[PDB]
Ligand binder design. Structure first.
Ligand code: OES
Ligand code: OES
Ligand code: OES
Ligand code: OES
Ligand code: OES
Ligand code: OES
Ligand code: OES
Length: 695
């Protein structure tokens, strides 16, 4: 069965770590890759769930909401809470609410880097980054139709077609699209999605490959994305009861939509056995909008001390009345990116070289036209007896609401060089990069204009030792930088923050046995983090520092043609080593322990031939609900099951029917809280039937 050897053999190749084709063992950093075969098996609903059984990442911190693919890697999120995802070696640079998403059914691969890597990609988050590989045209025909149906009125249909147009394979293509409709977990919310992905590959000769990659997506409704207070979730309400799992605190007429257009290409050319040129470019237009009413903690939460509405309440009702605000947003993002690389392979005695040098630049501009409601901008919500009604998003009086109209421009140009020198069984990775990062923000209401031009240099070095049995010990050191976007007291944009990581580990990748096992220890630390000013000024200050260190181990292997086992364990110790206020505490939403195990069996011989069965468990240890560590969030364990049946029997090979069940024991838990007034219920049990037919 396709996914057996895929998760353990194919999953051995990668490029997100070095930009050149390099096997996992020769990469001096922690890198995980999930194949499409695996994704086909699990049917993840997003890219997040596709990383479930990999170490060092929290894929479900935002609970049931699926609006964004936000990932917290090694206890770190990106600047401005924005995503940190790349599509085909190029970053889907977003801004404010404008963040693009790619359905997993359009992906071929998903590789995830852990730790710093600005060495190859410019400004990045300390924790790491995700890189999704689009499906490319197969030179072997593919004609597939798929039908989905399940819990919450989930209805989906999709197709994936690929074939050759010429007779020799000079022109091939791939067209894959889907249409999905479903109700959100929260009452009154729904999600609709429509995507089509046209790809065309032109191969002039055996040394040239030009592949056109386009993607279009329209989402009338993106679903729920609100805030619920801990009182009614983590903690029982004053009447001992807890808000229901599907509770919704937003207006009956809440709306949230997203539209995405992308055009670009990937080009390869090999001159000799010594030189190879490579270029990647994409142009993207993103549009997002929303009319949202969201919770902002109960009336007794110290966060609403200035709410006239809360105040005009008997201080007993104060603990079961939720305050609320709203936001009206509308953004338009334009993004241009090109990365050109020259790859040189040569020798020097007994030393084989693989030199990489490239120029990488990107230009984006986001046009925000929003309107936010402050305190008392929307009628309280009685948690004991909630009443969902419409909200007038237009009637906007300056008494409780003001505009927010910004035009953000970002820019980054970088030059980088890297060598992969190898002597016998020793491998040394050495590389550096220099970045020119300019940014400017124009506030249209105030007429002001803030800008800053950063210059940063980063590098990475590491050693890999290739024992002949598969054991490949290694160690490395890499840096990262992330410019700031917030303004200081002096009316300037703060200085960039930095990431420095040391890591030692081992990778077992035997050529003869189909297994992959990993273990690694690290000390990542983020410097120049923004912290509270040691003064009542509502402004912030630099010089902060957070430090994270831990152990991650991952295991993948087919104990037989019928059994496969995948799992991981993650111990992460993150902490504020120097912050004017939360010093000593551990960042919120970061658990110390994380474990996951999945296994599946398939009957080849017998009456149940072609039948597959799988189960898996992802354990999430406890975590702090706020940076003050004033309350915790209970650990939880979720179990998933699977039932698949090859249809070769009935007459159709390649095709199959499946039944997936997530959160089998329908456990009710809160995924996390980033504060007392910001918690999220986890996802209730879901059952989905999937028919995938191949002609
Ligand atoms: C085949 C599944 C996709 C069809 C979409 C039908 C319309 C969904 S929405 O327009 C109304 C939901 O009640
Ligand atoms: C092949 C599946 C196509 C089904 C989608 C039909 C249109 C739904 S949406 O485009 C308009 C809803 O009012
Ligand atoms: C059959 C699935 C639909 C494919 C996507 C078609 C384009 C949607 S968006 O590009 C324009 C919306 O008006
Ligand atoms: C400018 C600071 C941003 C404040 C956040 C306001 C609420 C947005 S989110 O909490 C709900 C979106 O529907
Ligand atoms: C050779 C034995 C045939 C058993 C197939 C029974 C029906 C399963 S499939 O045909 C429909 C699933 O919903
Ligand atoms: C779009 C509506 C069609 C839904 C078909 C879902 C699969 C049917 S079979 O695979 C399982 C039957 O229980
Ligand atoms: C959704 C329509 C699928 C088109 C495939 C039609 C049959 C082609 S192949 O199945 C046999 C060729 O001889």
């Amino acid at each position: 069965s396709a996914w057996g050897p895929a998760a353990t053999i194919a999953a051995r190749q990668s490029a997100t770590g070095t930009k050149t084709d390099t096997p996992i063992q020769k990469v001096p950093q922690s890198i995980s890759v999930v194949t499409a075969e695996e994704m086909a098996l699990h049917q993840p609903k997003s890219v997040k769930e596709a990383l479930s059984y990999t170490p060092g990442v929290s894929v479900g911190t935002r609970g049931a909401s699926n609006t964004y693919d936000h990932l917290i890697i090694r206890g770190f999120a990106a600047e401005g809470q924005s995503q940190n995802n790349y599509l085909n070696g190029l970053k889907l640079q977003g801004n404010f609410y404008n963040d693009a998403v790619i359905d997993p059914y359009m992906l071929e691969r998903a590789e995830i880097m852990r730790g710093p890597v600005s060495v190859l990609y410019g400004k990045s988050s300390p924790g790491g980054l995700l890189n999704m590989v689009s499906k490319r045209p197969t030179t072997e025909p593919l004609k597939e139709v798929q039908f989905k149906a399940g819990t919450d009125s989930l209805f989906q249909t999709g197709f994936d077609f690929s074939d050759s147009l010429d007779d020799d394979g000079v022109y091939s293509y791939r067209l894959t699209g889907l249409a999905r409709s479903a109700n959100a977990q929260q009452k009154g919310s729904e999600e609709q999605r429509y995507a089509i992905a046209p790809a065309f590959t032109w191969r002039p000769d055996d040394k040239t490959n030009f592949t056109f990659l386009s993607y279009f997506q329209n989402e009338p409704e993106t679903g729920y994305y609100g805030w619920l207070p801990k009182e009614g979730t983590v903690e029982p309400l004053p009447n001992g009861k807890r808000l229901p799992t599907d509770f919704n605190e937003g207006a009956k007429n809440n709306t949230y939509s997203r539209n995405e257009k992308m055009v670009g290409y990937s080009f390869d050319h090999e001159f000799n056995d010594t030189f190879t040129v490579r270029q990647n470019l994409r142009f993207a237009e993103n549009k997002t909008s929303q009319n949202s009413v969201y919770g902002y903690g109960v009336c007794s939460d110290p966060a609403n001390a200035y709410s006239k509405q809360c105040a005009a309440l008997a201080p007993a009702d104060k603990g079961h009345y939720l305050a609320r605000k709203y936001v009206v947003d509308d953004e338009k993002l334009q993004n241009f990116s090109v990365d050109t690389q020259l790859q040189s392979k040569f020798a020097t005695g007994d030393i084989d070289h693989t030199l990489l040098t490239g120029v990488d630049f990107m230009r984006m501009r986001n046009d925000i036209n929003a309107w936010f409601g402050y305190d008392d901008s929307v009628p309280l919500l009685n948690l004991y007896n909630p009443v969902n009604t419409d909200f007038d998003f237009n009637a906007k009086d300056p008494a409780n609401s003001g505009p927010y109209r910004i035009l953000n421009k970002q820019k980054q140009t970088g030059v980088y060089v890297q060598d992969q020198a190898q002597w016998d069984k020793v491998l040394v990775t050495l590389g550096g990069r220099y970045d020119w990062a300019d940014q400017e923000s124009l506030n249209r209401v105030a007429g002001t204009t803030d800008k800053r031009d950063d210059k940063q240099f980063t590098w990475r070095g590491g050693v890999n030792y290739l024992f002949d049995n598969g054991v490949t010990p290694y160690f490395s050191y890499s840096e990262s930088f992330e410019p700031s976007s917030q303004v200081g007291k002096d009316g300037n944009i703060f200085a960039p923050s930095k990431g420095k990581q040391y890591e030692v580990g081992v990778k077992y990748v035997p050529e003869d046995r189909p297994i992959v096992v990993t273990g690694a220890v690290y000390n990542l630390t983020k410097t120049n983090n923004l912290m509270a000013d040691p003064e009542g000024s509502f402004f912030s200050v630099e010089g902060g520092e957070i430090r994270a260190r831990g152990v991650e181990i991952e295991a993948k292997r087919p104990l037989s043609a019928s059994v496969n086992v995948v799992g991981s364990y993650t111990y992460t110790d993150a902490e504020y080593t120097t912050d004017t206020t939360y010093k000593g505490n551990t960042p919120a939403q970061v658990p110390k322990h994380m474990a996951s195990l999945w296994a599946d069996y398939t009957f080849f011989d017998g009456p149940l031939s072609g039948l597959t069965l799988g189960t898996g468990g992802r354990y999430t240890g406890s975590s702090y609900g706020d940076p003050a560590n004033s309350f915790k969030v209970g650990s939880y364990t979720v179990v998933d099951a699977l039932v698949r049946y090859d249809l070769a029997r009935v007459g159709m090979a390649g095709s199959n029917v499946a039944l997936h069940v997530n959160n089998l024991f329908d456990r009710e838990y809160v995924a996390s809280c980033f504060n007392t007034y910001g918690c999220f219920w986890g996802a209730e049990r879901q059952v989905v039937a999937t028919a995938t037919f191949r002609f």
